[PDB]
What does this fold into?
Amino acid sequence: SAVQQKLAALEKSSGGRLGVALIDTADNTQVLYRGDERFPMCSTSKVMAAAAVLKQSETQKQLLNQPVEIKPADLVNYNPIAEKHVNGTMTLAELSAAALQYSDNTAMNKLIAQLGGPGGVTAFARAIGDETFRLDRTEPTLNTAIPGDPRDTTTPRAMAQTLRQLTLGHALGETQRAQLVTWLKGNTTGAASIRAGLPTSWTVGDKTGSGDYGTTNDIAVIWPQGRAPLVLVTYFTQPQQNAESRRDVLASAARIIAEGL
Ligand SMILES: *[B@@]1([O])O[C][C]([C][O])O1
It folds into this structure.
């Protein structure tokens, strides 16, 4: 279609590999570009860790208020929020918020630990019907984004369907779902990514990811004013290990998608 021609052209102009999946919940139509190719998730995986903990809280009703100690040894490479609570505690709710809204890597590692390891995060994905997601490592090594390495990858199509189920569907309880949406809507790291390609009147909840090989990702739920919501996943990775982030590519893909509606 027109939109696939333009996404192909954008990809060609960028020098990298672009993966896009859009789900329009109005008619359950999908637009896919490299939709079944694997991409490194980087920090977009944090949505799955947070949702898994939310699912646990449906039975352990007080789980999110459980304090978790932040020790110096827990600190890894990017801990904007956990750093503020070293030698203190954060609740599982505060860690989930920090992982999602600030992409805090220490928070993510605490969520993985709560789930019994990366296998516990992957297990939740399987439980909600995502056969494609795989989490293999903890922070920060899950961001190595090595070409062809299947570790810590998913496909755009799979992530779009799963994000739809978590935020708009009923993979989570009503309170848990609302909490996840609130967290995503309050993301602080997404201004230059999908959000930048869309009308300012639209409400967006998203989770960015960045990693080696110039990997630049964003997954978003989008609420246009007076219109059915959309789920948009944009994955981008590059051939040079030290390539710079290209958030502009995600903005541009979002703009191209938005134009076609
Ligand atoms: B994710 O990708 O977002 C930021 C951090 C950097 O390691 O991980």
Observations:
- The chain has eight helices and nine strands.
